[PDB]
Structures are given as C-alpha cells and as structure tokens.
Symmetry: D2
Subunit: 119 residues, 4 copies
C-alpha cells in the first residue's frame, strides 16, 4: 500500500500525492468538495509522512487551506484487501482560527474520511 497517486473520498474530495521519499515524506495537492463557503475553494497543498517498511502503513499529513485561515490534519492507515484494492481509513481534525485563547474551545472539528484510488 503506497500513498502516491490520485485519491477520492466519501465526500467527493480529491487529492494527488507525489512520490514518497526514503524517509516516507510526501507532498501533494488537495481539492476539498466541502467548505464553509464552497464558492471560495481553491487547491491546497499537503505535506506528510508515512511509514516505509510496513505493507499497510500508518501515515499523517497536513493540509494548509489556501482559501481560509484553517488547517486540517489527517491520520490513518492504508489497507490492501485480497484483490489488491487499497483504502485509506482516516480520521481528521480541522482547526479554525479564533481571535484569542478564550475561544480555543470551539476551534477544532473532528471527522472521518475513507479514500479510494481514482481508477
């Protein structure tokens, strides 16, 4: 299971991950299907690390949203079924920008996403 390639998730978002280096580091581009103001969505860079030796590696990455002050992180594992089909099972945290520390409590959304490979 390697992260390199093109992926879609259960919300219809897509991402492309470039080559994974010897340290497990990767870059890519994320197009979310969902946002607070969807008319404002632009492509956003991602940067992460996976484990290299594991056949079904865990990984994490950060998405710097280019159209808001927020940041999302994803972590999960790449699984391979008996037919060679890959799925990324992930959970995420979406951090919004708040004015000061007294508003921190309302700043972090949580959710899930399941990704499959595009063709």
């Amino acid at each position: 299971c390697s992260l390199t390639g093109k992926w879609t998730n259960n919300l219809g978002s897509i991402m492309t991950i470039r080559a994974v280096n010897s340290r497990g580091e990767f870059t890519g581009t994320y197009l979310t299907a969902v946002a607070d103001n969807p008319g404002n969505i632009t492509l956003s860079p991602l940067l992460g690390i996976q484990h290299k030796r594991a056949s079904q590696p865990t990984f994490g990455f950060t998405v710097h949203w280019n159209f808001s002050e927020s940041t999302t992180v994803f972590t999960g594992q790449c699984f391979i079924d008996r037919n060679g089909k890959e799925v990324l099972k992930t959970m995420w945290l979406l951090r919004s920008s708040v004015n000061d520390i007294s508003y921190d409590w309302k700043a972090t959304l949580v959710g899930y996403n399941n990704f499959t490979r595009l063709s």
Copy 2:
C-alpha cells in the same frame, strides 16, 4: 507575529524542536515524547508540518513519524500571543496505531490535547 521555529515543551513534558519556517509555511523538526506504551523504547522522532504565514496567530498542523513504533501522530492548533508577548501553542492530536487489518480499524485512533510553551 508567531513562528513555530524554536524549542517547545508541553504539559506532559515532551520537547520538540522546530527548524526554519519557509515561505510556504513548511517546517521540519524533531519531537522527543515523554510518553509511550514502552517509554524505554522512545527515540527522537521527525516531524513535518505547515503553518499559515500571514497571520499573527497562525493555525498549523504537523505529523510525527514515531521512529520506534508503527504509529503516527498528527497535531493541529493555533499559536496565540498574549498581551505580554508570551506564546502558547494550543493543540489537539490524533495518534494512529497500526492494526493487522481493516476489521480492527475502529480501535486504532486515540485523541487528546497538548499545550506548548517555549523552552526559553
């Protein structure tokens, strides 16, 4: 303005060191956790992340690839500057463990918080 560059400790005693933040907001560093399932196996581990650049109190995220387990942690949060200029990173994290197959996926993700302040 808040740059993540420098050394930080959190409420559990962990230390991380963040190198220069580039013009995209990308940064690398190391993380020495104070806690693990077997603290005797802990080793210094690499991190990689992105912060926002223009904001004075940026949000950010980073990934820690634990060098002593098959797990990965991601942190996200915001750097706040108080009226005296003191910086605090308020973060939440997800710690992903490796499981043997997808039937075990449900039990693989721990959640928590950490507050960081500067070492020095």
Copy 3:
C-alpha cells in the same frame, strides 16, 4: 426522526432504544460487534437525551459496557431523506480505565458510526 426502535451500524453492532420521554430522555440496550476481547461481549445499557421539537434532532448517549471498565459516548444527528429513510450520523469517544492520571493521554479512542433502522 425519532430514536425509538432498533438500529444497526456499519460495524454490525445493534442497539434498541425505548420510548423517548417529554424531556427527550431515553434508555436502551447496546450489543457491540467489536471489542478488545470479543468472546467477553455482553449486552450493555445506554442512557441519553435527544432534542424533542426538531425534526432532525441532535442527541447523545452513554454506553456503560457491562464486560469491561470502559465507557463510550455517542453524539450525532438523526436525518430523514426524501423517501422517509432515517440515518443516525454519529461520532464517539471510547474511554478506557487507566491506572492513574499520568496515563490519561492514552485513554480515549475516537471514531464514527452510521446507524440505520433494522427493517
């Protein structure tokens, strides 16, 4: 959308929720399909509250696991599609018992579950 009735989720767990009172309070019984030691699973009580007036209410409940020292909480919303079909979209936290406060960091798992009505 009312919580009363019999439900299954995407992991194959089932639950039955009894009548919801005027305050939105409900009891029920939860059979998980998954656990650390699945051979030990027994039926476990749940207790929660939903909003009453809303057609698509938010709600929460606690499951006291009768076979371990852990507790799970679920929160989510009941949605009705155009055909009258209900789904509970939930997120959960599973709290394990740890020995003392220094282990608190490793005690809380997070996940999701989608529930649909049994027949």
Copy 4:
C-alpha cells in the same frame, strides 16, 4: 472511592452539579456552561449519564442537552483520586451542532477536553 455526586468546576469556569448516583451508576444533574456562541443566551441545562460503580477510579459518560440551542455535548472520562484524596475528572467531549441536512454533517462535531475539580 470516586462518586460524581456533588458540584464541580472545570478549566473554562463552567459548573455542574451531579445528583445521587444510583446502584446502576446512573446520574442526573445540571450544567452551567461558561462558554457558548452567544453567552448572553446561556441557560442552565440538564445532564444524564452513567459511571462505573465498583471501580475506585471509575470511567463515566454523560450527555448535556443544551436548553438554549439545538446542540448536544457528550463528555467521557475518568475520576482519579490522588495520594492526598483530591479528585479530578479528566474528560474529553464532543459537541454536536444541528445542521440542515446530511451534506453538512462533516462540519457538525467539535472536539475538546475539560478537567474538573470539586467546588468545595
């Protein structure tokens, strides 16, 4: 032994009052949050939960039905007793907002922590 019965404050200044814990571990109470989207609309809200009974440091969960919004929060955690007999509730929470339809479900769930100690 740790019973949730009594009054507690958390790190945000919120107060809750938990009534008698029954033989099943069930409890009701009230919660006065210090924080909300519009603090001027906050009202005292009911909670309902379950703790473990046999354990000296029980895990527990409860639901708060906010009486001034369409949201619901759930808390789960553990009551710890330290070597001097002081009790702390360590909790994590999920705050579910009401959204108009399932397409908005992704943005409906906030996560956080709270630490509680006794009022008195």
